[model samples]
Target: MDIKINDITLGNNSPFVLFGGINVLESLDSTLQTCAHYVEVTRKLGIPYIFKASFDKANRSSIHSYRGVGLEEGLKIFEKVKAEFGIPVITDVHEPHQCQPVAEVCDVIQLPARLAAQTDLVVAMAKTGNVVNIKKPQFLSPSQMKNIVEKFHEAGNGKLILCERGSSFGYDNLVVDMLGFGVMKQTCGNLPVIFDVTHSLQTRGRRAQALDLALAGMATRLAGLFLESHALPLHLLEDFLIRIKALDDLIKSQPIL
Candidate 1:
């Protein structure tokens, strides 16, 4: 199935969309600068683009860690991003009350990995009737995603995109079972699946490892790539996406035999 984010048609059969940006809304200036670069590169590469950044990192492991610019400040920043770049924006919501206000500005509201199964949150998110991106929780198997999909379905929304970001294979090791993509698509009735390469960055040690990982998921014929450039240098994004786009074109071009 395909989901529309504004005018972009995202589906497994269509060209993969790029959901890339920083981790948090750092500041208006940097957010705009970062988005400008993404816009330029995606335009040059002819890839569909959506700006992603979180207003709050609600699941921080420690209280000392900075979450992000809170909702009020973050939404203002996002508004500027839309006003300045003229592209769809995606941001996650943690609480039920947040969904309505967030859905007002964000083109797509992401359900954070930990909150993916919260029924109250799901209904709230569904009530907004906006496109949703559910981060596949690290502990849940892809097949179980059907229940989550059904949760939204019963709540009255079906415009969902499943996102994979690897799973806990052991205490410290995280792994992406490439086959999970097929499982989710088949079990969820062909919903668009996206790989969140940023969260899967489990100490891969180098940039090349990251590139290989991103390409590996795209090779599965996904609907989009959800990534972050928190540690990625600006100059490398263009070259990185050049190869990424080429691989996607190659993969989607061949018949799904």
Candidate 2:
């Protein structure tokens, strides 16, 4: 299933779309500065990219952890970013009430891994009629994702992108099952599957090792790759994406039997 975001085609057969951005929406100035840099680099590499950030982190790792600009302010910033860069944007929503307003601006709404199965949230989010990115929970097997997809289908929203962030291994980290990518693609009837390489880190995944792990996942022939630039310097993105482009091209140019 290919999702058309404006002129970009997101599918297994198409060039991979990059769901890349910073961790959260910090400030108006920071957001714009960062987005301009991203736009320049992606344009340099010619990678189809979307700006991703959270309005607020309801699941903050610590009590003192900083959340983002609240919904209203965050939307205002998003509008400004849209006006400034003219790029597609995506963010996660925690409640049913947030669906409508967020869907109005965001090209895609994300279903956080922790809330992947909330029926009301699913129904509400689906009704907004925006493309949805359903994060496969760390504990749920690839097969269980069918149930989540079913919920969206019942709610009348079949446009979905299944995301793999890895699975918990009884520790403070995640271990991505490379095979899960293929399982998801096959089990969900070839729905677009993406890898959140930034979050799939193992044991706070070493910054240096992120690329190798991301390479393994992309080799599976996915529709897209989700990444945040926290682990590495921004200067290396063009280099990083160059490697990804080569691999994605090599895989997609061949037979799929």
Candidate 3:
């Protein structure tokens, strides 16, 4: 279960792919600096890296929240980051009309968990011929992904990857069913599976504590880790070390059993 993107390699044996999502168009200098730091940290960790962001948060929890920098300004910044960092980058697309323009900027076009079952979105992304990551629609059952996979297949593009974010945990909450990992394997043959670790833990106000999240991550039989981390307050580096160490220990013990 391996995939190559430009010079970066991702698969079972590959080191964790450390990525950070940021408000890129907020400030040009800040965005570039953050991406540079991401590249440096990822190289230090000896893992491949990819920049993730949204040109527009098309589905925000609230309508009043910022949508993004819009496509024009946002994609320009994304292009700059790629050229400056010289690495693969990823971003999400919401509507079918956005596929071509987004494909022009990103190495991989991601379909958000909410839009995973949107056949038009899947078809448009597949037609771009970019490596498409079709997130498992949060509302769908694991066994029901067959039709979604078929959309991309019928478009003559099997370069599809399935990602499982957490499933709906009551209202305004999410829960990752580790079994979804195996179900995706059984149901979506030949498509690589991406288990979203960090986003699955997303809550309105609570940050995922190290120990509990580590235990939860160990419960999955994912091909690799899809984690989002940040850096601040130089004193918290130990928390950083402890977190990655826990993940490493978990992965080593599991070894994709």
lDDT of each: 0.91, 0.88, 0.68
Best by lDDT: 1
Give the runs in model 1 whose Cα sits over 4 Å from its true position: 203-205
**Model 3 TM-score, 2 decimals:** 0.83
Once fitted onto the true fold, the runs of candidate 2 whose alpha carbons sit more than 4 angstroms away are none
Model 2 Cα displacement at 113 (Å)?
0.6
Q: State in Å the error of residue 77, model 3.
A: 0.9
Off by over 4 Å in 3: 23-25, 61-64, 204-211, 227-257
Q: Which is superior by lDDT, 2 or 3? A: 2
For residues 142-180, write the lDDT of model 3, one tens digit per residue: 887777878888987777767776788789887877777
Q: Report the error of model 3 at residue 60, Å.
A: 3.1
Return the clash pairs for model 1, or none.
none
Please write out the lDDT profile of model 1 over residues 39-99, one tens digit for every residue. Answer: 9999989999999999998778999999989999999999999998889999999899999
Positional deviation of residue 122's Cα in model 3 after best superposition, in angstroms? 1.4
Overlapping backbone residue pairs in candidate 1 total 0
Ranking by TM-score: 1, 2, 3
Query: Against the true structure, candidate 1 has what lDDT?
Result: 0.91
